Structure formats: C-alpha cells, structure tokens
Amino acid sequence: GFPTELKPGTNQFLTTDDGVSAPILPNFHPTPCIHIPGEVRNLLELCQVETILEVNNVPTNATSLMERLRFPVSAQAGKGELCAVFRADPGRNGPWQSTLLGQLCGYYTQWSGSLEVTFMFTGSFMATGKMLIAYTPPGGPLPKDRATAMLGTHVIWDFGLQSSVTLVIPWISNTHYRAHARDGVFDYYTTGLVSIWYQTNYVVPIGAPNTAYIIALAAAQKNFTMKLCKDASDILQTG
Amino acid sequence: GFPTELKPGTNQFLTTDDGVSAPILPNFHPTPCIHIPGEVRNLLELCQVETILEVNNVPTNATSLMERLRFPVSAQAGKGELCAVFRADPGRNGPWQSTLLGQLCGYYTQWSGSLEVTFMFTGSFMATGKMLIAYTPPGGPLPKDRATAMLGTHVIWDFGLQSSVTLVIPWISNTHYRAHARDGVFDYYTTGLVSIWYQTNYVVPIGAPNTAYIIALAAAQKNFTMKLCKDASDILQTG
Amino acid sequence: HSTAETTLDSFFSRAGLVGEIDLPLKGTTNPNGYANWDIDITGYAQMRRKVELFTYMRFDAEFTFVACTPTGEVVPQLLQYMFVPPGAPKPDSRESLAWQTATNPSVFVKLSDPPAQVSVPFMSPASAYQWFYDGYPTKDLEYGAMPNNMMGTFSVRTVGTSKSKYPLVVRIYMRMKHVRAWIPRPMRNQNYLFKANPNYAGNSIKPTGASRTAITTL
Amino acid sequence: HSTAETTLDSFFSRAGLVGEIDLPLKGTTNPNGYANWDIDITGYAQMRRKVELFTYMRFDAEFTFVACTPTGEVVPQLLQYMFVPPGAPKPDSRESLAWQTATNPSVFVKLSDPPAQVSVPFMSPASAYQWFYDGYPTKDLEYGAMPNNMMGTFSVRTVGTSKSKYPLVVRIYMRMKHVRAWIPRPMRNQNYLFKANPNYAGNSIKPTGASRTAITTL
Amino acid sequence: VAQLTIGNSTITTQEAANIIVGYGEWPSYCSDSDATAVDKPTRPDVSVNRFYTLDTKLWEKSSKGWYWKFPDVLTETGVFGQNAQFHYLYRSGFCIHVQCNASKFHQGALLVAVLPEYVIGTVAGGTGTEDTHPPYKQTQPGADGFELQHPYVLDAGIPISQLTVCPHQWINLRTNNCATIIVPYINALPFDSALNHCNFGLLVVPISPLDYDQGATPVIPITITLAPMCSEFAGLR
Secondary structure, rough: OOEOOOOOOOOOOOOOOOOOOOEEEOOOOOOOOOOOOOEOEEEEEHHOOOOOOOOOOOOOHHHHHHHHEEEEEOOOOOOEEEEEEEEEEOOOOOHHHEEEEEEOOEEEEEEEEEEEEEEEEEOOOEEEEEEEEEEEOOOOOOOOOOHHHOOOOEEEOOOOOOEEEEEEEEEEEOOOEEEOOOOOOOOOOOOOOEEEEEEEEEOOOOOOOEEEEEEEEEEOOOEEEEEEEOOOOOOOOOO | OOOOOOOOOOOOOOOOOOOEEEEOOOOOOOOOOOOOOOOOOOHHHHOOEEEEOOOOOOOOOHHHHHHHEEEEEOOOOOOOOOOEEOOOOOOOOOOOHHHHHHHHOOOOOEEEEEEEEEEEOOOOOEEEEEEEEEEOOOOOOOOHHHHHHHHEEEEEEOOOOEEEEEEEEEEEEEOOOEOOOOOOOOOOOOOOOOEEOOOOOOOOOOOOOEEEEEEEEEEEEEOOOEEEEOOOOOOOOOO | OOOOOHHHHHOOOOOOEEEEEOOOOOOOOOOEEEEEEEEOOOOOOOOHHOOOOOOEEEEEEOOOOOOOOOOOOOOEEEEEEEEEEEOOOOOOOOOOOOHOOHHHHHOEOOOOOOEEEEEOOOOOOOOOOEEEOOOOOOOOOOOOOOOOOOEEEEEEEEEOOOOOOEEEEEEEEEEEEEEEEEOOOOOOOOOOOOOOOOOOOOOOOOOOOOOOOOOOOO | OOOOOOOOHHHHHHHEEEEEEOOOOOOOOOOOEEEEEEEEEEHHHOHHHHHHHHHEEEEEEEEEEEOOOOOOOOOOOOEEEEEEEEOOOOOOOOOOHHHHHHOEEEEEEEEOOOOOEEEOOOOOOOOOOOOOEEOOOOOOOOOOOOOOOOOOOEEEOOOOOOOOOEEEEEEEHHHHEEEEEEOOOOOOOOOOOOOOOOOOOOOOOOOOOOOOOOOOOO | EEEEEOOEEEEEEOOOOEEEHHHOOOOOOOOOOOOOOOOOOOOOOOOOOHHHEEEEEEOOOOOOOEEEEOOHOOOHHHHHHHHHHHHEEEEEEEEEEEEEEEEEEEEEEEEEEEOOOOOOOOOOOOOOOOOOOOOOOHHOOOOOOOEOOOOHHHOOOOOOHHHHHEEEEEEOOOOEEEEEEEEOOOOOOOOOOOOEOOOOOEEEEEEEEOOOOOOOOOOEEEEEEEEEEEEEEEEOO
C-alpha cells in the first residue's frame, strides 16, 4: 500500500473538531429551503437593535414589574436634583440584563464597542423643561452635583422641543481579567456612568398630570464585537 | 481504501519532532501582534554586544562584588610588572562567566569565532603612561617578562592619548573533545592568553589619585557561531 | 476587527451531550439490553433557550457516540446503533424485526473502536424546523405541536442473541452544522416548566435581571 | 558557516516536561480521581531563566500527553483531558458540569492509543506575554502581576462514573513554536526563590562566576 | 557649546555628543486606526513637553547607584504630572540627559542605561524564606529617585555586568561628562496607565568609584534633565 505513520491525536474525539462524517441517508433529498422573511446571519445584527433598558430596576412585586421599563419625572423634583443613574455595563447585572444586548453578552466572554442609549419622554404634550444627561467615563466618580456634572460630557435635553434624544457611549471594554473568589471572571472596570439631573423643574399648565415617565432604549453601534463563546444560563430545560 | 504499510517509528513520540498537531481552539483569533521595539531574532545578535568582563574575579566578600568589574593600576607598580592576565575561554569558568557571551555559550556545546576585548581607563584625566597588552596564541606559555611579551602580538596602550583600546582575538575554538572523569566535556585547549604589563609606570601630578581602575568589555565578532543546544544551569525554578 | 465568532454557525457549533443510555445488567432501567432514543436536541440543557431565540431554523447534525461501562471502562463488546427515520417503526423488543430492516440505517462498532460518527440531514417535510407553532394540526392538548420537526429515533443495543456480559453506558453528542435562522424573538426570561409548551409559573414571575434599591444608587 | 541553531525558534523548540499528574487509588494526593493543572511553562526547571532573557515574548504550544501506571505500564483505561480556557471555570469535583461544557475543548483517548497531542494558541489579550511587569493592576502583594499571561487550565480525569481501577500518572510535555521576542535583559545570576517575583537571598549573594586567587595567576 | 530652549526652559549643554536612540527607534505618535479612535487622544505640545531638571544627586566615593521610574518620576512634577494623573491612558517617548560637573582631577565612570519593566526584588528576609514585596517608596521613588543596595545584581538578581545589553551610555570623567538617551514608548500595548505601570527605569551606577585627593570637592553633582517626546493622553477625569 501507501506508507503512513499515525500521529498523536489519532482516534481522539474533539467536541470542537469540525471535520466531516458519513451521511446516514445518502439518497435522501431534504425538502428545499424556500424564502423566509428576516433571516439572521450574524448575532451582531441583533445587538444593534434597540431594546428597552430597565433602568428603574427596583420594583420586584410581581404586579409592578411593568414599572421597571419606565422611570419618572415630576413637579416635586427641584432644579438640580439627581433624577437617576446607572452604569455602561452591558454584560453585568442590573439594567442591561433587560436589553437584548445584555442577554447576548452573556453567551460571550469578552466584548467592546460604542453603545447608544435613547430616551423617550412619554409625558403629556403640554409639559416642558430641561434634563441634564451626563456621562462620566470609567474611573471618574459620579459627579457631586448638577453643576459639576455640567462640566463633564453632558447634554441638555428639552423635552419641550424634542421628545427623544440619543446618547452615545464612546466606548466600553470588558477586557480586564479578574480572579476573585476562586472563580475567574473577565469583568468590566469600565463602568462608565450616566447621570441624569433636573436642569429645570417639571412645568405644566392646569389640566396636565404632574408626572410623566421616560423609556430607555439601548443598542450598540456597528463597531461592536464579542469574543469567546460561553454558554451560561440560569434557565435550562427541566427534567 | 488506499493501500498502505506502516513503517517503524509509527506511534512514537519524539520530543524533537516538529510536526503539526490539531488546534484546540479552531475559531479563536489571537490578539494581533503590534510593533514592539528591539525584537531579537538570532542569539548571535546578543553575542556581539559588549558586556563587562569580570577580569578581577577574586573578591567574593558580598560587599566587594562590585570590585570584580574593575581592576586597577597604580604608581606603586614598577615598569615591566605584570598587571593582570586571563584566558580567551568564553565558555569556561572564570572572567567570561560575567559577560553575556559567556552565559550564552553555556546553552551550547561547540563554538568558534574571533572575539574582541575593549579596555577602558577610568582614572583621573591628568594621569598618563603606557600599558603593554599582549596575546599569546593557544599553546604559547605566558611570556616570562615584559620584553619577551613585547616580541609577541602586542599593543602599547597610552591612556594619556586614548582612553580606550580594543583588542581582537583572532580565533578561539572549543572543538577538541575530552572524556575525563566519566563525563564527556567538549573543552577548549585553545586557552589563548592575554597578558598586560606596565610598559611605563603610572605618572600623575600633585592633586590626582595614585590609583585608577580599568574596565574590560568583551563581545564576539560577526564571524561567531555556536552548535548543539545544551540546556545546563545551576539556577532552576524552585519547588 | 473580525466578527467571525458572532455568526450563527459559530454560535451553534460544538458537539454537545444530548443523550445518555443506560444498559445495566441487573436493573429496572432498560431491562431488555436495548433502548430507543427519540432525537431531542434540548438534551443539552443550555440549548433550548439558544435556539428559542429564533422562530425558524434549519441544519444538519453530526452525531458522535461514546460508549463504556459506568466507570468509563472499555471492553470487547460489539454494539448496534440503529437510526429509525421518522415514520419508520421503532423496535418493541430485543428481537423486533426492525433491527434488520435495511431501510433503518445501522452502524456497528466495537467499544474498543473509537467513537462512532455520522451526519443526519434536515428531515422535516417543511422548509424549516419551527420552534413555535400558533395553532393545531387538522382549549386543546394539540396546541403548539409542529410534529414535522421530528428528526427520528436512535435505537441502541448489544449485538448478539444474548444479553451482554457487561453493564453499559452510551453517550450521544451532537454538533449542529450548516445553520440558517429566521425571525428572531425575545430571549426566554422565565423558567421552563415543560418540554412542549412555553408555560411558566404564574406565581414565581421574576424580573428579567438583578434588582437594586433606588434608581439613584449604584 | 550556518547559524540556524542560534535562532530563537531553534533555542526554544524541543518538547520539555512541564507537568506530572498523579492519580493514585489509595492516597492523600488527588483523592477524587481527577486533577486541575494551570498551565505553567516554568514546569521545565531550565525554562524560567531562558525565557527571562527577554522582556516580551509570543508563541504557540504543542502539548503531548503521556499516561501510564507508576511502573510505566499500559492498561485498558479511557481518559478525558479538558482544557479550560482562561476565564472558564475549572471543575471543583469529579462530577462538576464543567466536564460537559462544550466551550471547554476536551479530548479523549485510551492509554493504549499513542500520546494525545494538541496545539494551543497565543491566548493573552495583550500583544505579547510579558515576563516582567513594573506596576500593579488597577508596598503591595499585586506587584509584578501581569495576569493577562494566563494560558489556561488542563483538567484530567478517568472517564466513567466510578473511580478508575488503576493508579495513574500523566506527564505533560510542551513544545514552544513560532516564537518572537523583544527587549533582551541580563541573565539571572542569582538563585530563584519564588515563582512570582525576582526576589533573591540578600545574604547568599554569590558572584556570577567562578573566582580565583590573584588577577595574575591562572 | 550652545544652549537649546523648549518653551520657558533653557539648558546650557555641549554641542552634540553621541546620543543613544534606544533600540534604533524614534519616539513617534500613534495613528487613527487603533483601539480608541473615538476618544481622539489629545497630544500636548505647549508647556507639557519641555525641560525638567530634577533635584541633582551628589556622587560620593561610597555611592552605590541610583534609579528612577517612568513615568512615575514626573506624575508628581508640574503640568505633565497634571496630565498623567487626571487622564486614563498614556504613551510617551523620552529624551534623557545626564551631566556631571567635575574638575579634571576627579575620576570615575558611570554606566547610564534604561531598563523596560524594571521590577525590583528586595532581599526576601535574608535567609530566603520571607516573601516580602518591595514597598511603594522602592517601586516608585518619584523625582528624588532611590539608591541601589545590591548594585552587583541590580536589586533584582541580575548581573549588572550585563546591563550594557540595554540602551546605555558611559560617562567616564576623563573623557565626557554628559550622556544623552532617546527612549521610545515600549510596552505590550498601544497605551496604558501612567500611575500603575512604570514602562521603564533609568539606571545610573558608579562602575569605577569616584576618587580625588583631599582638598578637591568631595561630591560630584549629577544633573538629570529630561524632556517628554510625542506624549499622548486619553479619557480626562
């Protein structure tokens, strides 16, 4: 015959070896693939979709779960008051878990790209005012007050003019490794922060509700990426 | 199938067989190599670098170890006196062990090329005099006196004119095999010798120290080479 | 700069464990030295939720068989793995004539011989396997039942007229290949209760993710 | 006239022994018939000093596994070698579900089958493995700790639900390939004390090499 | 002889002795297609990049040697220490200049080299059984620097006899007095932390001891002047 020497790894089964195997049904002609709308090809398509960010992830009472989707603003809040705050940690617990992006980050170990949060005011049409939305890069501590946050990368939002506004998070990178307990977790540290302060108070004419809610929607830019498939889940197929 | 006959050596593990094996992570795209200064490609690059030769390898007293790096010359030494001496044995014990060349020779069994020692006078600027530096090829016994060494390949060095001088060792070859005790060692025999005599005495004006030191720096020419990787060391990773 | 890892195929590769057969000598479990395993890709826990991200899918499966005794030992015993396509009759006994029906691909291998491995095509008579079906097949118990999603059954047994001399354990791995998916959908956020429907616990309705004290504290 | 032997690759080739697992039957050592080995290339004594000649390096490793009983005997026992990439969780027990996580490459082989052999890539998220780090990760005990130099862990165990019938010994060899190095530095001349830092014995500070009587005697 | 100026800093130095461009590379900047192309990293030119003249150290007969860490030395000093601290990332090249002032009646030889990732190793208790980690005053001495205690092994278990393998230059009193070295950014990453990681350390040790007859000044001032080259920063805080 033809001279050969078998090399180590012969007869082994690698769960990730993508070789070919013998077709059980050689003659079978599987029913032809026809056209179906919205085919997905690469998960990052999904990551660029706006999902509702449960910033108000505080109520747990079963019947108030719908409340996590929206946080509110009211007349009672005085100028300068801090409305709300959260981090730019897509994969870690908290707000991002609600977004689709967040859930997909979970099947991966590393990632990086620019994010993008959009805020939607759902209050009465007659209401007006200004909100200051500031981003404090990783490391920078949550600004003491409105004015100090006013010096950072911020955006004055007048929902009297535009009902929507989108903020871009320049960058977030879950790359810095951590071996705490005895379980190694490739964690953030890049917990960028997004604060939101009442630049002015909530103003309304008689006849309009003195409270309104807002909805956070997030997605990642086209420069987003992920690495290291890592299947992990609390939800599994029950016996 | 395709006819084959397995030949001897089949299923063996050669610690030096450089074949290919299956990649554990087929999809993984390892972080790209970026540019980093001073990349080394072939060890012989290192061998051509000047390292301090501890000619004065005599003090062992912990706090006088820095003294091995430099030997001295003084007024007290009379004309003709032998200042110092050593061999051209890069790989063997003694002076060369301090040089980087020496340490690299240790990971190899054979070698050959022209060497090159450079002497640096670090005395006061006001001092002057002459030193005779002679090389006695392998076999030739250390010259009796200055005059007999004066007839051999020598160099008169006036550190009154030039503070540095470089000597070239034409050739050294660790090729002659030796099986002494019961442990076979590919040894020198080519112990070329370098002697250094006070051609004149050390002359200095009032106000200048009556002693000065000198530094030996060695490296090998571009014609240097080594053969037979041989890992050997007294320093190893402790338990 | 590359995004090869975030592709469908990349996401669904890897041969996962989806089945495990026990063939004890003395036992309540598979007393006739044989077993029938209808192909369930949910066999790998993590799987269900991953695929249920899409409405429709299509793919081929590469099956690799790992057999040994309970301590993971290797012994001189021959085995028959039979694949009964959907619509074909599974063996009711250790001597059912199904074992000899040519139209049921079968593969034989010794425990010593390395893993058995075969590829199985996209069966479904439909254009794609569909994880969700909002209807019934021409209050009911036939709701959400898209049967045309059957891949077939795998019948395993010791070769020979008599019971095997050793206690055996077969493990079935499955790598999904050539995957195509359509219509993406919300990631299951509630615990699964049944293999058939999406029913959940209406008392234990938990918030998708970790909660906190105030919306002003981090 | 040729200088092929003095190249980096030539210098660092050769598969050296860097690991040895003991899986006794009765013993204090690895009582659960399994073991976890975080990849340490210093495992080959001679190694540390050779690599510590450079500041930065990059390379691939070819691993070859040699398993037998203490007397170097071969027996009919199957084994699982699992590679858990850095960031992946190592198995805490002989039944940890990690053993079945597809994302942890695993390879199976019988002791009879010749050595197992696989290549592992340049892991590090950094552009190069760096043997020296003059700082801390964002008087301390975190000094000189460049963690992004982890290659991963190798988990070994007898296949099967039950302990193996034989006492086993696995040896791990590692050939370094495709090597690139930067910034050369002084050859360690003092004895090593710890696997982490360059600390030395401040009493036992020895002269790089053999001493002599006078500088005029040979 | 002539004097060069960079802003408000004016040093009197010799015409142009031999300079040592470490590893043959010149401290350059970093292009747009990198890791952070969004947060366009601002490159200081004005005051940030000029001549800093550190507290002169006094050479003595008994001197063992000195070393400073980078960029540590400057993160304390002036408007550069300003950027290094309140900024997330840093990459910078360096021009280092070392000079002595001694009469033609003093003698000595200082090796002056730069060593990437200079990791200090203490004594470890003495007998070798204490895992003591070098303090913070030893790991990052600042602008005053720090003195070696075991020069021969460079307080780290490596022969100094082989330090020449690094960008070095000699200062032999009877020939020169000033040594100059250009250092490029060297690290396994494009950018990094300016307060946590010290890319390298400046080393200056007396290989031939200082000497002189009674009556001549007993200490030789060594003056280190240095200037940042193509320094960049990213992510203000």
